[model samples]
Each structure stands twice: as C-alpha cells, then as structure tokens.
Target: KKPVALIILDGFALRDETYGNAVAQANKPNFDRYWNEYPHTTLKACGEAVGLPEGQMGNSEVGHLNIGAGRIVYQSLTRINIAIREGEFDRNETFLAAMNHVKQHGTSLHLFGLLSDGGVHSHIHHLYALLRLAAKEGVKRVYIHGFLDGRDVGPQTAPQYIKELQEKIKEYGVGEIATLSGRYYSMDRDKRWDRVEKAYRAMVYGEGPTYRDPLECIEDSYKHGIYDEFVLPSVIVREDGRPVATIQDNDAIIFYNFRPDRAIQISNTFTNEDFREFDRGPKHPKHLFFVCLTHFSETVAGYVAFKPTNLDNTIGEVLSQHGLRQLRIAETEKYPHVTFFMSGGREEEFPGEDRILINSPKVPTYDLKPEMSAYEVTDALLKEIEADKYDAIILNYANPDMVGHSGKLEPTIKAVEAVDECLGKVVDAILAKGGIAIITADHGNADEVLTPDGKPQTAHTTNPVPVIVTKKGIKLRDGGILGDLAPTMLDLLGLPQPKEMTGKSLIV
Candidate 1:
C-alpha cells in the first residue's frame, strides 16, 4: 500500500574484480550499504534476455523498454535481421522506390548510418545489404556517409570496418565512401546543434576538411589522439579536388540506422523543410527524398521502412489505470528514457503522469564534467517526494553511462560516486515516507571501463546488473532479468499485474 521509487542507475553494473572498472573503484557508500543490508540480486540485462541477438550488448533503448513493459521488447536489429533472412529487406517497396527514383532521374543515391557490427545502434551488414540493393537496381551514382563507432565496439578499430566496406563496395561496384565522421559529430542526442552542423555541412555542402583517401582521414585523426568515435567531420574528394559525393536536389537518401534517438536530429535536418537547428547553406537540397530504416519520430519527414514495436499496457499505463499519480524525471541526456522508452515508445504522457527534464551540461564530451546534472535531478525528485503527491516516481541518473563513453577512468569513478551521493539522498527521503526504493541499472558501462589488455573499452558490457530493494524481510529471488522490474513494482504498490505483463514478480 506504499508508493514506489524506481531509480535506474544507467550503465551501473557489477564486476568486482575487473581492472579499471569505475564502479568497482568508486567510493559508493550508499550502494555498498544497501547491498549489505537489503535484499539484492543481480539481473541479466543483455542479449536474448532483452530480445536482442544472442551475445549482443544491451543498450539504453532495450533496457528501459524491458524494465517498463515487463516483457522482452525485440529490438530493431533482431527484426531487421529477420527481414534480411526472409529476403524481404531487398524487396521492400521503400528501398525499391528510392533506388528507382535515383536511377530514373539520374540523381545520386545517398546511404548513411553507423558503420559497425556492434549491434547497439546499427550493424555493418545492414550497410552492405543496402549497397548490394543499390547495385542490383543499377543506380549509377551512389554515396555512403559512414559514421565511425568506437563506443559500441573497439576504440580504434575504424580502419577494420572501413577496409572491409571498401572491399564490398569494389565487389558490388556501388557506393563510394563519400564522408567520414565520428558518431560524436553525426549522432548528438542532447541537442548539440554545433556538432550536428559539422556533419550536415560536410555531407550537404562538402564543407569539412577534404581528404583524398578515407584511410588517411582516419589516420590523421589518430595522430592527434582522436579515436574512431571522436574523429572530426571529413570529406573524401577526387584528384581534381571535387568532393566524391554531395547531396544535390532530387537525390534519394536513406538513413540505415534502425535506432531512433541519435538518428532523429540528423534525419530532421534533411527531411524537415523548416529545419532551423543550424543554418543550411545555399546548397541545401530542395527536393530531397528521405527514408529512414525505422520511424524515428513524427517530426522526421521521411518514409519509414520499419515502424516501431508497439508496446501496450506498459507500467505507466497500468498505474494510470489504477488512478495513481506518477512522476518521471531525468536530465536531458536520459529524459527520453524515463519517458518515451519507459512508456513503450509513446511520446505522450498518460493520465496522472508528470515529467521533469533538467538540461544536460553543454560540452564537447561528458568526460569533461563527469557529474552531469545529477544534483539537480536529485533535488527535483526530493521536492516531489516531500510533496507526497505522486504514488510512483521514476528517474534515471545518466552519469555512469555518459561519462563511461569517454573511456576515462578517473572521471568515470567520480561519475559513479556522484550518483551514489544522489542515491543516498533520494532513498532516504523515500524511506521516511514509508515508500519502497528499488535501485537497478538498465545496462552495464562503468563496470568494464577497460578491456583485459588495458585498452580503453567504451562499449557496453554483457554483465549482470545489481537490483537492490530497500525494504526489510522481503526476499528477492535470484536469476531474474530486467523484465521482472515492472511486475515487482506493481506487486509492491498493491496492484495486480496487467494481463500484458509476462514477467512474474521477483518476490518469492
């Protein structure tokens, strides 16, 4: 009969002995005391448990969806792979029309997305499939904008994917690597227009530093301590000093990324006629035809090849049906997770649902300021807890994951500690009100900051996350996965689990 406080420590995981693990190294008194005193168990959050491909690392999108839906939310990569295996990917009308449109008009066909097999946001094979389709359609002019990924894979392995892509392009005789840039520039989710502008201008106007060869561009960034994920926007050009490919009027463009969060901004720039985030120079394509691998948002004016997985009867909806007031809060970086992703990809709020969004720090990278709006989030939640108006409160502290992406050890440690301090304050307030505080993580990042060989590992790890419940005498069963969280919250709130929730409560 009590309110529930569900706190997700994003990217917090348990691996006690891993060297250079920021979570292990951090001085988290709150977390340590809770684990020692409360009923805590580790949960499997990655791969097939969350509906991703087996052995794939779980990301923020899959994690939050699983936690709220109380069921496996099959991710985009899994669905896309099925489409390819069934031979429906190439025959899809969307891809066929885009290819045909480019061919008949004698215009260029542009393909852009993350070029990695990490299976977090995208896969390299997806790009390969599109290239093959372009070749089969006999599209004479093709250009590929490759977004370098290091945070989802190895920190410095861009050349490996680049060379393999080059071989496939040569064999298929379609699509030259026209632009190369880090995910930082091309995939800013925190409304960083400056970074987005660099990528947009480079692809649209050929405005970045020109490189005669793609290999040289990556190598040059490495020389200056820039890795694959942070490589500056660069353009590939011919010996005559002309950009190999640039967006022109009437061009057909396809964004191959299935994931939506990072893809939404760039998609808006091309698809939205009234785009005002950054100035589009005089060369802006007037009649651009855009298609996305999946529907990012209603704002993206593109043909969606794959729609989002509809999730009904989410926890928030169930709570709303019971006439319970709820609150969701997070900083700008993860505000969407606590709302959109947690509510089953729905942007609209349910009845009795209120949300608070604190602006994320403005910077080139999170490592510069490891503590990112954590105090503000905690303070905001504290006031809500004091008001005692909401029956359910949910929030995500994004420090661990955001700073962990930087691959910096000391800063990540500070990031974990900062969250720990906030956790103490939040939980103490909830306990005073006779409420239950459930602490867990969506995925793992800070637990494995460095690989076994001491290389900076920025990717999410396939590790179990700790789920600690701050109520005495209640036993938490072992071997639970992230899907059980929503059901458990319902159980504690004295509400019956909805029929759509497949996950059983964790209490034994």
Candidate 2:
C-alpha cells in the first residue's frame, strides 16, 4: 500500500556514468534501494528540456518550474543567450534606449549582472561583449554592478572572478566595477528587505562600509573573519574617499542578470516609484531590467512580467481539484522552489493549506550551518506524517546543493553522508505509516563539481536525474523527462493526470 510523501533533493542526481560522479561515490543505501530494488528511470532536466539555453545546463528555478508545471517552459537565459548570438539581444529597445540615455544625458552607462560564464545567472563573455558595444557607442565611464557569484560558477571564489574581471577591464579600458556583494546579501526572495536594503545602501547610496581598493578589501576581509569572498561586500573607491559610481539622476542603468528570482527585487528598487521596500536613503531610482528578464514568480513585484506561452495549471492547483490535502515544505534557501517555481512560476495553495517553511540559518555561508538545517526540514516532515493530517507531504531537503557551492570537497562528502542518514529516517517514517516514499533530485551540484577530464570547475550537468517510486511496486515508463513528475505524482495518488500535463504517469 502506498501512502504519499515525495522528497525533492534540490541538487541530488544520478551519476550518468559507470565509474565516477558524486552520486555513486557515496554509500547512500536509501537512494541505492530505489536504483536496485524498485522501478526507476532518468529524466532530462538540463538544457532545452528545462527551458535553458540549447547548450547551457539547467538550474533550480528552471528545473523546479518544469517539474511542477508538467511541461517545458522557455527560460530567460536561453532566450537572452540566443538573442545575443543572433544579434537580437543588443537590438533590444530597452538596451539601446539605456545606451541612448547615457549618450544624450552625458552620463556614464552602468551594467549589472552575475559575473560568470555559468548560464544560470549570466554569461561573462556576454557582459564583455556588451561593454565593448557600449564603448563603440561612444559611452564613457560605464560602471558595472557585479553581483558576487559562487552558486553558479566556482564555489566561494568571488575574488577570482573579480580579479579576472579587473584584468579584463584593464585590458579593454572601458568600464570599472562600482560595487559588489554576494547574491545572498541582496537578492532577497523571502522578502528579507533588510538584506536588500544593505546591498542597496552600499551600491546606490555609497554610504556603508568602504574599501580603498579591491584586492586590499579582499585580503582584509579574509584576515578579519570570513575568508570566503562571496559574502564580502566591497566598493570601488576614489582617491578622494568616495565611491566611483552611485545611481545618480539621468544615468542609464543596464541589468545584465537574466535570472528573474533575485534580480526582480533589485530591479524593482528602480522600477516601482514610491517603492518602500526600504528607505533607500533619499537616492536611487526604479530599474528597467531582469533588464526584461521574466517577471519573478507572480507572487512578487518584479522588473518585467514573465510567463510561459502555453501555460498550464500547477501541480498544487491540479491536486487541489482532486480533494488533495497536501503539505509542501522547504527552508528559506529553497522555499520558492517547492512553491512559486514548482507551481509554474506562480504561487498557488492547496485546499487544506499548502506548505510549511522552515527558517534556514542566516549564517553568511551555508556550509557553516552544520548540515544546513537538513534535519530541521526532515523533523517537520515527521511531525506531520505522525499526525497523519494530510494526503501528501512533499518536501525539499536542501543539502549538498547549498553546501556544495562552497567548493569544499570533504564537506560535500560529509553532506552526502548526513543526507543519507536523513533519507534512511524518512524511508522508515513513510514506510511505517504505509505511505509512498519518493526520492529524487531536481539537478546536480555536489554530485559533480569538476569537469569530466578532472580539470577544474563545473556547473550543472546534462546528466538525467533519477525518479524512484517506493512503498509499493510501481513501474515507471522509460525515457521520462522532468515534465513527467507532475503527472506521475498525480498517478501515484490515484488521481487522473490533467490534460494540461504533458508527460505520462509513472505508476504502471
């Protein structure tokens, strides 16, 4: 007999190889059981399958969006990358308009985005090209607002990228970096306005902490405490003890970060006049970007409104129609994934209420949180399962994904071990109550951080993730895509798949 509890590991995945890869390197008996004993198969979660660039890998937001929507949706990164390659991106009105504003107003142009080649947040080469175009357009004194990255690029090596950019800028002699901080500090999706407020103050007001030089700031921040470069905030200061660039009137701003989730908040700071997320001092203006990135989850106010063309209902909404009383749970790190993104970039609650969100630690680094509050997430699962108050309990255990971003190899191994222990507990809890035990990962992170040739850094992979059905002998179809998840979930609960859902059910 199958009861219902689906566990979504934010970054777990199948090895996609016979010998190496993180999934097979560990002793994950619970995950192993799904592979060895029950019906299991892979799902295409990367690239165009999840609405990403034709060549770029998928990310949490795109992966979760497809999983819950039951179909592929176009991603902003894919569209932007294509447009850039085909000369359509620069042809964008907003982009050209921003440049024109700079030229006509005699004001400097500014650029903002993730500073990486990773396709998730942005592509560095794209930014370089954009900067050169600005220079060709006769724009001078262009300031780049770099959002510190490690999640999509190398782990915790913001200075490496920053220095790389420092050299590149020196070589090109077009623009300079104005200010920077970890994406964690600003991109507040959970409405952590204070975090956004701090980043805003530093970049916009130039009124916060000051750093005379970039490398000096990096070295000092390390010696002081957090050697990690991702979370450290810095401003490119002038000889007169002032920030090089702040958002002044008539200056045109261009946000290059294509990802919608976090950028929406920062972009809105410039878009919504009378915006009061925080008193951004008496300065700063509304924005004109994701610069046209998809509007964030319909739940939040965003730069440009984004949605899929052939949109369908979400799993949450679909299940609600079937007398579904379910609970979806996650932490602050992954709250929106299981909700907004999982609901096709929308927020829809179930009839018996939708979710339980555990608060993740506010520590600067996720690795420092000691097992990343994984047990805290599982403990919530147990309480509700024991209470037997809901039909389905779907939760996300954000483990190695968050910690793996630190690029700490041993800690990631330990992360897998700890998650294995948690999975064992979850299997027992669900089985003891005769409930369905579903174990699967959205995308891969700790599973693979190095390139196949064992060289250096790597981002998300094209490896297909596993979908295993347990608590009963259920058979899944071969060649399943991530889109199969929504309908498969419905089938396991003995509910009919809605017509809007594109994939076949897994329960044979």
Candidate 3:
C-alpha cells in the first residue's frame, strides 16, 4: 500500500504585495527554482471558495478538512442554523425524540457553547436560532454560557456578541430565560491568551514574565480595574441601554460555540463535581441546566452530570458517566483547526525554550527553495514515516498567514516563499515514501487589497485559498471546500465516515 503524506501549511496563502515585493525583492534561490518546476494551482481558501455557507470565511479547522477529504461539508454553525430554520426539532423525528426527552424527563434545558459569528468557529446566528427554538418548544428558563474568542474574531467583537444576545433574548420575549454568562479569560486568543497570566505572575512576584495568561489577570482585573477594557460594566447594558440581570441558576444553560477547545474547560466547570473555582467572578449558579452546543468525544474524566451532543461517541459516554444522560452524540459538522508553524531565523527568540522559534522566513512563493525551513519540516516528517512512527501527519507553516497578517507586501511575499520551500520538502518526502501530500491553508491573510492610502492592510483577507493536491494514486476532484478534509482523511485510512458527516471523500 502506498503511504499518503498530508502537509498542512497552517496559514500559507499568496498575497499580491508579498509576492510582488518580498519574493520579488529577496535573493531566495530555492523558492524561485521550485515555482519554475512544480505544477501548482491556487484555489479558494475561505467562504464559498472552501464550500462554506455564503459569506463565511475560511478557518483552520475547515481548511485542513478540505485537504483531507477533498470535499466540503456543511460546518457546525450552518448546520445548526438550518435545523432551526426548518423546524427540525419539531419536524424531524430524531431531533424531536431528544426534544421530547428534555421536555419530559429533563429538569431543565441547559445551553452552553461559544457565542460568535466571526466565521471561524461558532456564530451568533446559530446560537440565536437555538434559543428561539427552545422558547418555541415551550421550554422555560434557558441559560447560556459563552466563550470569548479574541483569535477567530477581534477582541472588540465579544461585547458586540453580548449586546446582540441581549437583543435576541428580548425579541424572543422569553422572560423566563435567564441571563447568559461565561468564564472570563477562558476564550481563545492568538497573542493575548498568555498576557493575562504574565501580569498575574508580575503582581505576585514582581518579575517580568513572557506568556499572556488571560484567566488570572481577567479575574484580578475585574476587581481592581487594572486594565482598561477588562472591567465589567457597572450595569450590564443592552444595545438599547436597558440593563440585564446577572446570570443565575434555575436557568437552563447552553454553550453556544461549536468549537471544542474553548468549550471543554467551561464544560468541566458545569459538569465537574469538584468544580470550585469560578474564573469570571465569585458567582456560581445554584441550579442550572448545562448543555454544550456542539459535541465531541469525552476524554476528560471526572464527575459531572449533564450532556449534550457528542459528535464523537467517546465524549458521549464520558458525559453519561458523569451523569449527563442527554446525548447529542453524532457528527453534525466538521470543523478542523489548522495551525501553521514558521521557521524563524536562529537569532529569533525561542517559543518557550523547548522548541526553536520558526518565524516566517523572508521570501516569495515563486522564489522558494527546496531546502528551506518548510522543506525541513517535510524532511523531519519523512524521517518519522520511514520509522513507521505514525499513520498520518498534519503540518502547518505560518509564512503566508503571519506575513499576510503583517500586511507588508514585501515581507508577506518573503513569507510565502518560505512556505513554498517547506511545501516542496513535504512533497519530496511523500514521493520517497510513495505517499500522497495534501496541501491547504486555514484562511487568507495577505492577498494585496489596499487601503485608501495605498498601504497594505495586514488583516485576514476574505478571499478563496487554494487547495493543491499532489499524490501518486489519489485523485482530488474539483469544487472542494474546507469542511471536507476530515471525512476524506478517514476515508483514505479505510475508516468509516460517521453518518452525520456532511463532507464527501476526495479520495475517489
């Protein structure tokens, strides 16, 4: 059997400026050589380009899946929204079964998940739909637990989400519904995640630290107002200036976010028997119905009572063991988080000491060489494959994403060249092992859209990313999207795609 090697460059994308300036300006021979020889193509990276709902942007999770499956699946937020729109709970027998179970035996309907629509993970539209459904079903006293996302969306979006939620609740006229709450500093952020903790360390020992730990600092800041935006409003103001009450028990709680990483921590808080700490504040609900908006296999062990949908069966049993009998254990959607690792120069600071800091090498996609850092990652993986260390490897190089984020055309092009060099290495390794290499990206960061002043905007571009496939025996069909990679990978490995998977295998 031929082995297939899939190397995912976490945030690699082609930017007009980066390609025009950095690669055009840099003296990188390797990148320049590869672009001349290899047969490469650029495809859609985000939104409809990756086969997501129209207007959605590409993210890491969906991007990798597209490469793996070679197809597109409906994402979590879209799926949930569709169900709500079609009255699936009322019309669909399967959903109705669960709804009936909640209405009869369930003491309170709990809702817990991420609350956002930055197009990366969870969305406010989906959460609003679920809340509306619960109210329509005659469920009283719904609870919402939110997760903050500074990475997928900007930090400012969090308040907007909260404000919108307030409007949603009022529109539903569900006075019985309780206020939504979340564990402060628990949300995911690109750079700020560690900053909060660093501040806490300084306060305790009066020493400078590196990581930005959000939890400790957020908790502390709430009390002392040490930071400007970290303080809670004296009154929780709605969009129209009305105040809402603080979250309380006797309200059913639902975790609205579809992503698992940020949701798991808060899930533990609601389900764990020994859960004593509240990171947001001292207030903990006396009685509440806690549920996760999305589902995953439960690997976390401990005591807890309450369960929602577990896309993977493992988490379902875990939740059941902890006393959460209500199960939504089926694959509703595929959302993959793709991370890119760029190789920085030796002079760059190491990422926390153990590993080398791989900064985006300066080069253009066209000028990328074969032996660059991108190539090194491929070479390393090949060595591992030769040793039979693993069946599949998921790799990401951040040259394109990071450089694009910088919004500097020259550096961005250099970053792309660095990524291409890495890509070449993985492709060579796959060839040596008689494996297939699938390459793709999460979202587009730099693609040459300029502002009024002619300066490059170093923000995420709402463009389609290309998914290039180079394998000996595998054939990827056209019209693939980000959500299809997971099922496709499972298919290639001769594994069965779960019934709920909306993605098709690209391995045909």
Model 1 residue 354 CA deviation in Å: 0.9
In terms of lDDT, the poorest run of 10 residues in model 2 is: 299-308
As for TM-score, the candidate ahead, 1 or 3, is: 1
Best to worst by TM-score, what's the order? 1, 2, 3
Predicted structure with the largest TM-score when compared to the true one:
1
Per-residue lDDT of 462 in model 2: 62
Query: Which of 1 and 2 is ahead in TM-score?
Result: 1
> What C-alpha lDDT, on a 0 to 100 scale, does residue 345 get in candidate 1?
89
Residue 321 lDDT in model 2?
A: 76
User: Tens-digit lDDT track for model 1 on 1-508?
Assistant: 2569899999998886759799999999998998899989989999889999889889889999999999878888999999999999999899998988888888999998998898888899999999998898889998999999998999999999999999999999988999999999898887888999999999988989799999999999999998898899899999999999998899999999988899999989888888788788776887877999988999988798886657889999999999999999999999989999999988999999999999988767788888889999999889888888999989899999999987778999999999999999998888888999999999999988888878787888888999988989999999799999999999888799988899878887
Which sections of candidate 2 miss by over 4 Å? 16-26, 100-108, 132-141, 156-174, 188-195, 207-231, 238-241, 268-279, 283-292, 297-310, 348-353, 449-461
Candidate 2 per-residue lDDT over residues 148-195, each given as its tens digit = 666666655667777888787877778888887767665656678877
Q: What's the true lDDT of residue 368 in model 3?
A: 43
**What TM-score goes with each of the models?**
0.98, 0.84, 0.57
